[PDB]
Structures are given as C-alpha cells and as structure tokens.
Amino acid sequence: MKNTELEQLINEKLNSAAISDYAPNGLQVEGKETVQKIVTGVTASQALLDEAVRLGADAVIVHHGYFWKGESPVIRGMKRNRLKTLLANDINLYGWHLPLDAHPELGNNAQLAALLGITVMGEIEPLVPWGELTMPVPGLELASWIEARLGRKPLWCGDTGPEVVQRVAWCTGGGQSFIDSAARFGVDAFITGEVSEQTIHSAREQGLHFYAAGHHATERGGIRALSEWLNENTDLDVTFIDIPNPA
Amino acid sequence: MKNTELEQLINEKLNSAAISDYAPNGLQVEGKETVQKIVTGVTASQALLDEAVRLGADAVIVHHGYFWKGESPVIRGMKRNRLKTLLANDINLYGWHLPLDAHPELGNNAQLAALLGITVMGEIEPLVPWGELTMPVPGLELASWIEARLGRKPLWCGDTGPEVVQRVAWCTGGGQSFIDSAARFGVDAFITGEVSEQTIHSAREQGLHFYAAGHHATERGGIRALSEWLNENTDLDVTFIDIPNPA
Amino acid sequence: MKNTELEQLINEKLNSAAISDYAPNGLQVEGKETVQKIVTGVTASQALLDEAVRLGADAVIVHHGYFWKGESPVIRGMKRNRLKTLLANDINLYGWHLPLDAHPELGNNAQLAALLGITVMGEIEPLVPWGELTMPVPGLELASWIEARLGRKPLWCGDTGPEVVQRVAWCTGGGQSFIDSAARFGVDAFITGEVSEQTIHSAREQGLHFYAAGHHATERGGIRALSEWLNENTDLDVTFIDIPNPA
Amino acid sequence: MKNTELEQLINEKLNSAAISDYAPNGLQVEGKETVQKIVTGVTASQALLDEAVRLGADAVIVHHGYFWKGESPVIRGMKRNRLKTLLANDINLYGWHLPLDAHPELGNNAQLAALLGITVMGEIEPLVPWGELTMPVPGLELASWIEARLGRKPLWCGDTGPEVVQRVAWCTGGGQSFIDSAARFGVDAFITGEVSEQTIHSAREQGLHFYAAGHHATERGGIRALSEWLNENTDLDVTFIDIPNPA
Amino acid sequence: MKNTELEQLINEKLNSAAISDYAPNGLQVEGKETVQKIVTGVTASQALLDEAVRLGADAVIVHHGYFWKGESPVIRGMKRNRLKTLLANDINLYGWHLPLDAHPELGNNAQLAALLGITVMGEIEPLVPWGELTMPVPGLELASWIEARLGRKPLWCGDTGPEVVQRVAWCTGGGQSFIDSAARFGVDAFITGEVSEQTIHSAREQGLHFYAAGHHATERGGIRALSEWLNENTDLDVTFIDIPNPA
Amino acid sequence: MKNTELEQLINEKLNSAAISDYAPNGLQVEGKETVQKIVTGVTASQALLDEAVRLGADAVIVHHGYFWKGESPVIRGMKRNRLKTLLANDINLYGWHLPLDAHPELGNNAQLAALLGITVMGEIEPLVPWGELTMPVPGLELASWIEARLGRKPLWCGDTGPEVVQRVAWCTGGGQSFIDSAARFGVDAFITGEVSEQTIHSAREQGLHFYAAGHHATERGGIRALSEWLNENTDLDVTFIDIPNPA
Ligand SMILES: [Mg+2]
Ligand SMILES: [Mg+2]
Ligand SMILES: [Mg+2]
Ligand SMILES: [Mg+2]
Ligand SMILES: [Mg+2]
Ligand SMILES: [Mg+2]
Ligand SMILES: [Mg+2]
Ligand SMILES: [Mg+2]
Ligand SMILES: [Mg+2]
Ligand SMILES: [Mg+2]
Ligand SMILES: [Mg+2]
C-alpha cells in the first residue's frame, strides 16, 4: 500500500476530516512511499520508535503523535531524537487523536465499554458516552473489576457514591474535566484516565463514584482495535505493542 | 479587622497586584464587614465551608477559589451550594492562587523546599525554582523521603535518572508541564503535584528522576504558612484546616 | 566486559563452583562476546526475555534458568520460543541457582532476612538459616508484616504456634520440605515460598507458625541485590525487572 | 473381616500390585487381626488418628500413609507420635496412593471429574485424564464453579487462555508438573491441586487456563468413594472424616 | 472436701447467689458426702457421666446441668438414664449457668476474649461485654482467626460490615438475640455461638460482621478455667473433659 | 383485589383465626387499597422490601413479618427503615406464621415432605407431622439427598441412629425443641431447620439421625406454594423471591 493510500484509508474509516483537533490527524512525518510492516502503540515515544526500527517497520501509527497546538516547532532534545529515528530510517508516522477516541466501533471510548462490560446507550457530549453495567455492582467491586480488566489499580473515590453502580459515563485519557457534565446528566459513576485536584471535589459534592484508571491504560483499546481492523481488511503486517506507562 | 483591610494586607504581603492569574486574587465573595475568626484551607470545597460555618468563621482564605477563566458564570449544582453557604452566612471568601505559589517566604514552592530539605538557589522560570537537596540521596530514597514528609506515596519515575539526586527543580500542584523546561536547565530530579501521560516520556527520555507528589499534598504548605503569618502579625484568630484530597 | 569474564566474576563472588546443583550455574546460553547492557529477573521466562530484547540487552541474568536435571533435552514449545529469542538476538543467558540462594550478603536467604527484620544468627543446614526477629510479634501480626513487606498475602498456618514469634528459620523458594528440620532445631516459625499438603501437618503437630510467602515474591531479593552489586562494582548497565508471578 | 483379608479385597478392587508407587500400598502398620469399625481420611495425620481412637476404630485407611521413598527410617518427633497412637491401640493403618488416584470408578481423578461436571474421554498419560465440561464456560465462571463445588477458592491463572473452556485435563494433588504434557496434548484448561513457580509460566506461555485447586481439597473424593464402596460391599462400618487442610 | 463445702466455695467465688437464672445453680443432684476426684465438662450429657463412672469421680461439674424452668419433672428416657448413672454411683452433680458465663476472670465471656485477643473495655448489657481486638483485621481474616483459635469454622456473615474490624461485642452460647443491642451500642463485629434466621438480617441491615462460632465451641472456656482454679486453690483432683458437640 | 379482601381470602384458605400465634397473622401494615402486584418471600427483610419497591409491588406477603410478642414497639434502626419503605410507597405487608407452617396442602411442613419424598402418615403434635420415606436409606445418604433437594448442606448427627432410615418426623424452621417428642413417639430421624446445643445430646442419647437443614431453606416451600395457589386462583401477579439466608 502507498503511504498516502493508507492515510486516506484510515481517514475515511474514522471520519477524521470532519473533526477539529489539537494536532494534525493522518500522516505526520513522511517516510518511504511503500508501506508493508506497521508497528502501532499508544504514543510515538522514543521507546515505540526504537521497536519500529528493531522490527524493520515501514510505518508507525499511534493515538498521540507530535505537533500539538502551542508547541515550539524547534527541533531539539527529545524532538530531535524522535524525528531523526524516523527520518533516517524512512519511517512514516501517523497519528489519529480525537477520531480514534470517538469511533463507535474501533474508538478508545467504545473499546473501554466492551472491555469493562458496559452497554453503550447514548452520548452525553461528543467524547462522553454513558450506558449501564450489564452486571451492576458496588463501588468497591467496580474498582477491583477495572483493576483486573486493565491490569492497573485505579484511583477510586466514592465517599458519597451510590450503593450500587449501574449507570455510568466515561471518557478515556485526560477527560477528568467532563465529570461535572456527567454528574449533571445523572450517573452513578464517572470513569476516566487522569485526575486533578478539582475532580475529587466534584465526585464528593455530586454524589458519584469516580475512577481515574490511567491515561495509557484506558487508551490502548482503540489503536489495538485499529491494528486488528488493518490485519483483517488489508494485507498489511500490523503489530500493536503495549509499552507500559504508569500515568 | 475590616474585610477590605485584610484584603489589602495580604495583597501587599504577596505582591499580588503584579501577578497575572487564571482567576481573581483577593476578596472573591464579600460577606460581613468585620472579620475576626478566619478558617483557611487548600481549596474552598463544600467541606471546608461547612467547617467555616460550624466554627462561626467570618472569612475563609484558600489557594483555590472560584471564577476560573473560561468557567461558565451560571450558578448551579456545586457553585449554588457553595455560594449559598457563604452568602447566607455572611462569610468573606478570599483566594490567592499564583501569588501564594511564588512568595519567597510563605509560598507553596518555598515551603515545599523547606519541608523536603532543599536549598533554593535560583529560579528556572517564574513558578519553577531550582536548588539542591542538603543531603543528596538515590532516586528510591528521595521517593521514600517525599512520602514520609508529605504523608503520601508519590508516583516515582527514575528509569533513567542519575545514581544520586542533588540538583532539583519543582513546582507545586499541576506543574507537570514544566518538566521539559527543568530538563533543558539541567536537574537530577523534577517534583510537582499531578502527572500527565506525556510527563512519563519526558522523565525517561531526558534522563531525570520524576516525582508526582500530589496536587493537594504539595499545596498545604503555603496557605498553612500564611495562616501562621496572620496569627503572628495580627489579632485575627486563624485556623488552617487540612481536608484530605488524594489528588 | 567479555561474556566469559562476567561469568568468572560472578562465579567467584558467589563461590558457585564449590556448590552442587540441579542445573548448570553460569553462562547457560552463549551470545555476543561483548556485554555492556544487562536485564535481570527471577526467571528467564518468555516475558523477561521479550523485555531484554526490547531494551537492547546483551545478556540476561536470573535465579531460574534452563537445563534442570531430568528434563528432556529436545527443544520444542516454550523451550524453542525461549531459545530462539535468545539465540537469534545474540543474547547471553546466565543463571545461578543454589549459589544465589545462599550467599551471606547477596543471596536470597540473607536478603529476605534483612527485608523482614530478622537478625541472622546461624544455620540449621546449608540452605536453612535461622535467626530472631529484632521486634518479636504474635503469629497474626507477623502474617500482616510479611504481607506488607513482600506485597503478597502469605498462607499462614498457626493453629499451634507460640504466643509470640522470636526465633525463626526460613528458606526462600520451594523449601517447604525443610520444615521438619527447622522444628527439630527449635524455632517459633518457619518461612518459605511454596506449600505442600504435608507441610501443614508438620506445622500443626510440631507447634510452629508456618508461612508460605511466595516462591517468586521471596526470590526477587537475591537477583536484585546481585544486580546492585554489578552496578556498583563494574561499569556494566544492569536493570532488574520484576515480572509478577502469583506462585 | 480379617485385617489381611480387607487388604487383599482393596488391593484387588484397585489393581494395586500392578502399579509401581513411591510408598507401600496396602497394610502399612499391622494392628488387631479382627477389623470391624474403620475411619478413613485424606492423610494419616495425628488429628485423624486421634479421631479413630475417640471413635474406637480398628483400622484407618488413607490416601497418604507413611514410608515414602527416601524418607529417614528413624522413628522420632511426629512419626513417633503417630506410630505410638496406632500401635498402642492395636489399630491397623492401610494406605493406597497412586492406585486410589487412578481407579476409573472410585479414584480421585474420576471422582473430581464427576464433581466438576466433566465427561472423561481418554487419558493423556497415566495419572492425567482429559475430557470436556458438559457445560462449557469462560475461565472466570470455571474458577467460581470449582470454588463452589470444592468449597475452596482456587488460584486461577488464565491471562492467556481461550474465551470459553471446554476441553480439560487434570491430576489431583501435586500434579503441577503434568501441565506441559497437557498443553502438548491440546486442552483449554489444566486443573490440579498444588502450584509451583514454573507452573505459572507454563500457563501463560502455552495459552491455557490453569487452576491450583488444593491438594487436600482435590483428594477427598477417592478415599470417600472407597469408604462408600466398602459400606455397600461388606458388613464393615466405615466412616470418612474430612479434617481441613488448606494446602 | 464435703460436697456442701465445695458448693459454698464455688458459689462465693462466682457470686452465684446474686444472679437470677433459668435453672438451679450449685449442687443439683446430691451424692456421697466426700468429694476428692471431680470430672468437669460443658454439659452433663450421658457421655460425660459415663466418663465420670469409668474414671471413678465423686463429682461432676458443668455449665449446663438439669432442671431448666419449664421442663417436665417426670423422669423418663434421657433423664432416667442420666439420673440413674449419677444416683446409683453416688456421684454429686453441680452446675453453674449464668454465673459461669459472667465472672470477669473465670467466666465463659472473659475466657473467650482472652482466647481471641480482645481487650475487654466494658459491658453493653449484663451478658454482653464489648472490647477491641489488639490486632484489628478484616472480617475474612477474623473468621480464619476465630476458626484457628476455637478449632471450628464459624458461620461468618459480613456482607455489609466494615473493612477492618476493631470494636467487638460478644456473648458465648446462644446469645444471638443480643445482636441488635450490640448494633445499637456501635461495633464492627458481634460474635456468639448459635445463630437464628433473624440473626442474619440484623447483621446485614445494621452493617456489622456476625460470627456464629459454636455453642459448645465457645463454652469450654469457663468450666475449663474453673477446673484449673480448683486444682490451684484446693487439694482436689479435677480433670476437665471436652466431649465434642457440633452446635 | 381490595387489600382487606385478599387478607380474607388467605385467612380462610389457611384457617388462620383458629391458630393462636406469636405475632398477628394477616395484614400487618396497611397500604393502598387496590392490590394487583405482589412480591413474596420468607421474611420481610429490607432486601425483599427493596425488591418489592423496584418491581412496583402493591403488597408483600411473607412467612415472617413484624410485631412479635415481647418485642419493643419503638420504631428505630431496622424497624424504621423497613416501615418507612412500606408506608411511604403504600405497600401492604401481610404475614402468616403458624398457619403457613401447618396447612395440609400449602404449608411448610407438607411442602418439605413432598420435596424430600416422605409420605405424610399422621402427626405427633400440632406442628410435627410424621411419615415414611418412600425409599428408605442410610443416614449418610439421607444427608446427601436433603442437601441435593434443598441446595444447602445440612448438619447431620447420626452417631447413634439406625442403619437405615425409614420413619421420619419433622418441623421446619426453629423446630429443634421437638426432637424429644419425636423420639418418644418412635422415629428413625428428625428433621428441622436450626439446631441448639441440647439437640445434639437428644440425638445421640435417643438413637435417632438428626438433620438441621436450615431455617430459611426449609421455609421457602410454604410461601412459594401459596404464591402459586394465588396465581392459579386469582388474577393477581405474584412473584415469589428467594433471598438467600444461610441460617
Ligand atoms: Mg485521548
Ligand atoms: Mg495549584
Ligand atoms: Mg498552585
Ligand atoms: Mg527457587
Ligand atoms: Mg531458590
Ligand atoms: Mg497426592
Ligand atoms: Mg494423589
Ligand atoms: Mg450456654
Ligand atoms: Mg452460657
Ligand atoms: Mg419459622
Ligand atoms: Mg415456621
């Protein structure tokens, strides 16, 4: 496949062109024209890049690439190491940020719901679906469940959360700021990846169970999902590598 | 003391005028004129408020108040309950954000340094001081040190940091975004309150020990220090109340 | 350093040659001659092996390697996957079994003692040290201490143990069979890693507190200290990786 | 019945003499010639023995008796108390080990298959049957079924096992070393009583669900079934006593 | 000692005369005047009486004797066999009920707290002391702790109890009716011997852990302690005998 | 149906006013007048009440209601929660105690006998029927059969009962005090729900097999049968709900 054909293929599968974002979606750094072996992971860290070079990948696809709004375009320190590892080896880098969080099937938000056992039912706002657990359980049990399914112990705050959690809303990664919107919609628990100082007061004062189950942990689902989608719908050789990040 | 007097007293001790901020610094909600019993804390949470009410406080002073830039001005949910507890009881709410982060004597950044045994020596950027531990220790020992001093286990990332940590930079609260700037300046360790997904790659790729010691935990120092200053320089009856927040 | 050189350095520090074993101690699978980066772990599993590859290790060092007496020589299944990862990448695999259980300073046994707060005072038999807890406590209290220090709830049988445990014998890993020898010597508790059906009768009928604290959990001690020893005594770059194992 | 007659009766029903074992099968300790009341249990522990004395038994029959190969012959400590209790009271001790594991009808392996709802279909190796659950289920439901049926929560490692378990191999007691042969055979799960450190690597790297269901827990079926068969086929009064053992 | 002397001596030690009871406390069935050898136990069942005869005792002392309020006076069945064994052999039968449950030193309630490691701190109601575990633990562990100290697995209902148990109330024997009084006083656990249908709802709806640890299991303590007290304070020969009872 | 009419219908089918009881039989807490949907169960616990609320029930009928003789009338803790749920939602509570144990067709005693396979042949006293198993069996087998039909392992004491059980007497619930009455009449076994310390002695000394099969497990039959009887003879929608209770 040509690198530009692959950009167009996933752009169309994820209705990318239609979504405003904090960074460029699609081909971020151009490499050789022909793409046959693909390495993907949550973030284009130096460590993922090093696996793509070790594996002889032609392209790398991630949910967090470079060139974020507000960033300095200067190329030094980390940025110089990353771009040189890509450019010298002719590796194509693609990033799909909000389109891969939102897709109904392959997105981070839909995959978390499948992994945690939540029946999606509607959407509170663009990146915040809500639904119900198919097996309603107490706040403590839900924490252990999230810990067993993502393999990471979440920050659980449920000082004033309901006795049993049924209705839930969530947003993967750094979606702590949607907690009020979810509490205002009416839920039993709100789940996200990161947490901030104010997030705790929102859970306490609004009567809900809150979980920060990890930015990286809650965001392996979509890129892994898109990687499967590529292996089943093309002849590409796509390998998804989960490189652990505590955050 | 009069409410407007107290405002001008603390505004001048913290050179507040000369500091751009994300929210109004000073008297945020006007209550009775005469102030004598003051309750303070890290954030004007409903819980700190109900303590002010139980203690028959005339004013509450915090580091995190209301009216953050970009916030919806409508008064509903939590803002209604909070503002009603203050206006109905004639309690003055005062808040100081960045000026209480930076003051060289009473600020959260100077009080963390005192607490962890760091000799301040310069400033990399306005909210980010640098200095040297008085007793250099290996990354593991500094993590245990931070946890004993703050009473909270920090997230520590030292995959690629020096054998012994001597030079340190820091920013209390959510200053994770200052990590690359500390890296370019040159430090063995960077400490702040919260953590983001990109912060972990900044720690590994630039070879430094990183600690996320908690937003609330790294921010009890300054408003506690200011409360002492008030009890020591005025006849005001000030009680600092620490309400645990895991974030 | 030269792979054969690193083999002689550790053999001599651990007095390996003078100790008969169930498997070869030293370089078990040869790789590239020049070793500078090493990854270590309790067991040369496929998981550790994959982390060694990913981090560009030239050698892997473990407490449990391959070629155990009685095992079939044929290379198939897990053996084939494991040997290939090592051989295709020129990675040296070394292992030290009994020699790393027993070394007075760096061994598994002496390191468990320091972690648990036991003053070593002697040995009942070659892999069975004896000593006393610096702070004597009841059986139940000791169970929570071992759980807190090792990060794993131990199986505790104390149906007939003394009211306070002071004198203790122990043997990391699969040493449940040394319990009768410990009882005849005279101790209040026996601690090991695994448990067997007969172990519980031994505990009960001989009046001691028995603890099965984890084969893996009790054997991260030696390999991690041996890794600290190499970083402090050579210029090799050694990283210990703990890959959790329930047993 | 005459003590030696009962020996011969059970030796024949179980085809004992044709199975090489690690300890003597049959009458291990002679007692009064005339047998009428018999107490049975998993292991000839001091507790079962004291029970047989209290009930006035003339014999005891167990799965685990004495005299294992390589054990010291000397009679001291536990052996002295156990042998004294039997000899002073003229109580006959019988033990059948591998024969009582294997009998197609009354054996521990067949009894466990019946308890867990597994249709026996063949034999992988002598002590390791295989079959299919009459009701296939995911690995978590099976952990719960085993825990419900055995009365003990098993250790369940299934991080890489199939979504639904149907084909199963098992060996009661200490059969962990048989897991690799079951993998080669091709099964979705392997169940045994104990666990060892290498067993967890075998489950993960070969993709199967593994369960250490308890050594004593998985071995009550056989001696209990034998006890039932004697009450149905002789005029003997045989009682089975389950004396709890968590291993 | 004269039988009437021994009665007077235990009455005063236990402050018996000043306690209303459901049966006569003291000498219930008179026998020979001179008492030298005494056998004791929880209940004057036929099995106990029979040991008294075999052992040639002059007297038997229990916690549960005869003549309970409400009982038929007619002497037939069990009562005839029991009374014949005592009268024909001239054996004295003494029984102390509530006095032996309540004595602060020798009573069933004080002996259970010492067996279980509880520091007695006061009394909720006449037969229900309250106290704190010197080693607080979760409800599951306390269950295992009760099992091991008593030698019998208790029924543990802890669906809604606290995460850690510290304050506890108890009443040996059939004291399940006191669970609501304990819940009203404020406790993390209530322990007794028997259980009733309603006892479970009290536990669940009042948020405490409940344990039915055995009527007989929890009442060996008092009569055994009075037995050691007689042996230490007189020249009598008293043997306490535990005859197992499941309830 | 009108609430006072339903009361009447069941009072007459169970000949209730004729039976004197420990609590009022019939409508115990009046609710809305029109009843159409009804939830039933063994005891009016908070848990059944909350189900009745979830399900929109107009009435709840149980075997155990409130207002037992001797109980305090005050409404607090548990009674307040329960009564508030009923009264605030206008749910009628009806309860029938002894008339629901005794009815020849629908009662707990007759329904247990149909379940267990016993032909009822007459009665010893009011709540204690007697009969014979259609298939006589040893007491061990009877234990296993009771466990299979009721779903709970019973306590079986058969130390001294007949080799085979044929004639049986039984009382569901707390009927242990009837065991001496069954023995004098002449039976092989006596079956009830709960057990008490003295019941074990009655069993041993009177030579009968005794089974405590569970107060809750033996009392589902009646209210379940009454609920079917209401669905078949009225237009009411009745749902019997089993809320497990181990006692
Ligand atoms: Mg995202
Ligand atoms: Mg801040
Ligand atoms: Mg700040
Ligand atoms: Mg080992
Ligand atoms: Mg070892
Ligand atoms: Mg075995
Ligand atoms: Mg076996
Ligand atoms: Mg009693
Ligand atoms: Mg009592
Ligand atoms: Mg009843
Ligand atoms: Mg009843």
C residues 116-155 lying closer than 8 A (beta carbon) to D: 155
Count of other CB atoms within 10 angstroms of residue F1? 19
* One domain, residues A63 and A106: no
**H/E element, B56:** none
Q: Is A214 contained in some domain? A: yes
Name the residue in chain C with its Cα closest to that of E115. C163
Residue C115 · residue C148 · CB < 8 Å = no
C/D touch flag: 3 or more CB pairs below 8 Å: yes
Residue C135 · residue C58 · CB < 8 Å = no
Q: Is F105 contained in some domain? A: yes
Name the β-bridge partners of C192: C212
What is the three-class DSSP state of E191? Answer: strand
* One domain, residues F136 and F55: no
Task: Tokens 């309630």: give the residue.
Answer: E109
Residue C62 · residue C52 · CB < 8 Å = no
* One domain, residues D147 and D212: yes
Chain B residues whose beta carbon lies within 8 Å of the beta carbon of residue A245: 197, 200-201
Annotated binding residue A219: yes
Annotated binding residue F101: yes
* One domain, residues A103 and A1: no
One-character DSSP codes across chain F: -BHHHHHHHHHHHTT-TTS--SS--EEEE---SB--EEEEEEE--HHHHHHHHHTT-SEEEEEE-S--TT------HHHHHHHHHHHHTT-EEEE-SHHHHH-TTTSHHHHHHHHHTEEEEEEEETTEEEEEEEEEE-HHHHHHHHHHHHSSPPEEE-TTS-SSEEEEEE--SS-GGGHHHHHHH--SEEEES---HHHHHHHHHTT-EEEE--HHHHTSHHHHHHHHHHHHHSS-EEEE-------
Name the β-bridge partners of B64: B43
Distance CA A222, CA A100 (A): 6
Chain C residues whose beta carbon lies within 8 Å of the beta carbon of residue A47: 54
Among the partner-chain residues C157, C184, C216, the one whose CB lies closest to the CB of D197 is: C216
Distance CA E159, CA F247 (A): 14
Distance CA C33, CA C56 (A): 15
Tell me whether A51 touches chain C (CB under 8 Å).
yes
> Which CATH number belongs to the domain containing residue A21 in this structure?
3.40.1390.30
Count of other CB atoms within 10 angstroms of residue D70? 5
CB D43 to CB C81 under 8 A? no
* One domain, residues E58 and E109: no
Chain C residues whose beta carbon lies within 8 Å of the beta carbon of residue D195: 194, 246-247
Q: How far is A112 from chain C (nearest CA, A)?
A: 24
Residue B73: CA count within 13 A, CB half-sphere: 0
Interface test with E, best of C137, C140, C141, C209 (most E CBs within 10 A): C140
In B159-174, which positions are buried (b, 16+ CB within 10 angstroms) versus exposed (e)?
Answer: bebbeebebbbbbbbb
The strand order across the sheet containing D128-137 reads D118-125, D128-137, D165-171, D189-192, D209-212, D155-157
- Residue C160 CA to ligand 4 centre (angstroms): 28
* One domain, residues A89 and A122: no
* One domain, residues E188 and E101: yes
CA distances in angstroms from D65 to B132, D42, D58, D68, E208, listed in the order given: 68, 9, 16, 8, 44
Name the β-bridge partners of F59: F38, F92
* One domain, residues B201 and B107: yes
Q: Is C30 contained in some domain? A: yes
Query: If DSSP states are collapsed to H, E and C, what string results for chain D?
Result: CEHHHHHHHHHHHCCHHHCCCCCCCEEEECCCCECCEEEEEEECCHHHHHHHHHHCCCEEEEEECCCCCCCCCCCCHHHHHHHHHHHHCCCEEEECCHHHHHCCCCCHHHHHHHHHCEEEEEEEECCEEEEEEEEEECHHHHHHHHHHHHCCCCEEECCCCCCCEEEEEEECCCCHHHHHHHHHHCCCEEEECCCCHHHHHHHHHHCCEEEECCHHHHCCHHHHHHHHHHHHHCCCEEEECCCCCCC
CB E215 to CB F201 under 8 A? no
CB C46 to CB D201 under 8 A? yes
Nearest by Cα to C169 from C247, C219, C109: C109
* One domain, residues D106 and D153: yes
CA distances in angstroms from A136 to F33, F52, F61, listed in the order given: 34, 18, 27
Domain count, chain A: 2
- Residue B219 CA to ligand 2 centre (angstroms): 7
Residue pairs between chains A and B whose CB atoms are closer than 8 Å: 96
Name the residue in chain E with its Cα closest to that of C204. E148
Annotated binding residue E63: yes
* One domain, residues E102 and E187: yes
Name the residue in chain F with its Cα closest to that of E217. F197
Query: If DSSP states are collapsed to H, E and C, what string results for B81-129?
Result: HHHHHHHHCCCEEEECCHHHHHCCCCCHHHHHHHHCCEEEEEEEECCEE
- Residue F102 CA to ligand 9 centre (angstroms): 33
Count of other CB atoms within 10 angstroms of residue F48? 24
Residue C225 · residue C180 · CB < 8 Å = no
Residue pairs between chains C and E whose CB atoms are closer than 8 Å: 13
Chain C residues whose beta carbon lies within 8 Å of the beta carbon of residue A50: 54, 56
Among the partner-chain residues C141, C158, C159, the one whose CB lies closest to the CB of E135 is: C141
Q: Is D140 contained in some domain? A: yes
B/F touch flag: 3 or more CB pairs below 8 Å: no
- Residue C73 CA to ligand 9 centre (angstroms): 68
- Residue C164 CA to ligand 5 centre (angstroms): 28
Name the β-bridge partners of B128: B125
Q: Which ligand is nearest to the CA of A64?
A: 1
What tokens appear for A147 in the block?
A: 């810990």
Interface test with C, best of A48, A54, A153, A243 (most C CBs within 10 A): A54
Chain A residues whose beta carbon lies within 8 Å of the beta carbon of residue C54: 47, 50-51, 54
* One domain, residues F224 and F214: no
Annotated binding residue B63: yes
Q: How many residues does chain D have?
A: 247
Annotated binding residue C194: no
* One domain, residues B79 and B112: no
Residue pairs between chains C and D whose CB atoms are closer than 8 Å: 96
Residue E146: CA count within 13 A, CB half-sphere: 29
Task: Tokens 């006589």: give the residue.
Answer: F136
Residue D206 · residue C78 · CB < 8 Å = yes
Chain B residues whose beta carbon lies within 8 Å of the beta carbon of residue A202: 78
Q: Which ligand is nearest to the CA of F101?
A: 11
- Which domain, by its residues, includes C167? 97-218
Rg over alpha carbons for chain D, rounded to the nearest Å, is 19
Distance CA C62, CA C78 (A): 17
Q: Is C169 contained in some domain? A: yes
Q: At what angle do helices F221-233 and F108-116 cross, to 10 degrees?
A: 100
Q: Is E246 contained in some domain? A: no
Count of other CB atoms within 10 angstroms of residue B95? 24
CB A174 to CB B184 under 8 A? no
Q: Is C246 contained in some domain? A: no
Chain A residues whose beta carbon lies within 8 Å of the beta carbon of residue C56: 50
CB F246 to CB E180 under 8 A? no
Rg over alpha carbons for chain C, rounded to the nearest Å, is 19
Q: Is D26 contained in some domain? A: yes
Residue D46 · residue D82 · CB < 8 Å = yes
Tell me whether E202 touches chain F (CB under 8 Å).
yes
Chain E residues whose beta carbon lies within 8 Å of the beta carbon of residue C138: 117, 135
To the nearest 10°, report the CA torsion of F1, F2, F8, F10. 40
Q: Give CA angle at F216 (F215, F221), nearest 5°.
A: 110
Distance CA D29, CA E227 (A): 38
Q: Which ligand is nearest to the CA of F107?
A: 11
Among the partner-chain residues D47, D198, D245, the one whose CB lies closest to the CB of C197 is: D245
Residue E86 · residue E94 · CB < 8 Å = no
What tokens appear for F175 in the block?
A: 């009927």
E residues 99-118 lying closer than 8 A (beta carbon) to C: 117
Q: How far is A233 from chain B (nearest CA, A)?
A: 31
Distance CA C169, CA C165 (A): 11
Residue C132 · residue C119 · CB < 8 Å = yes
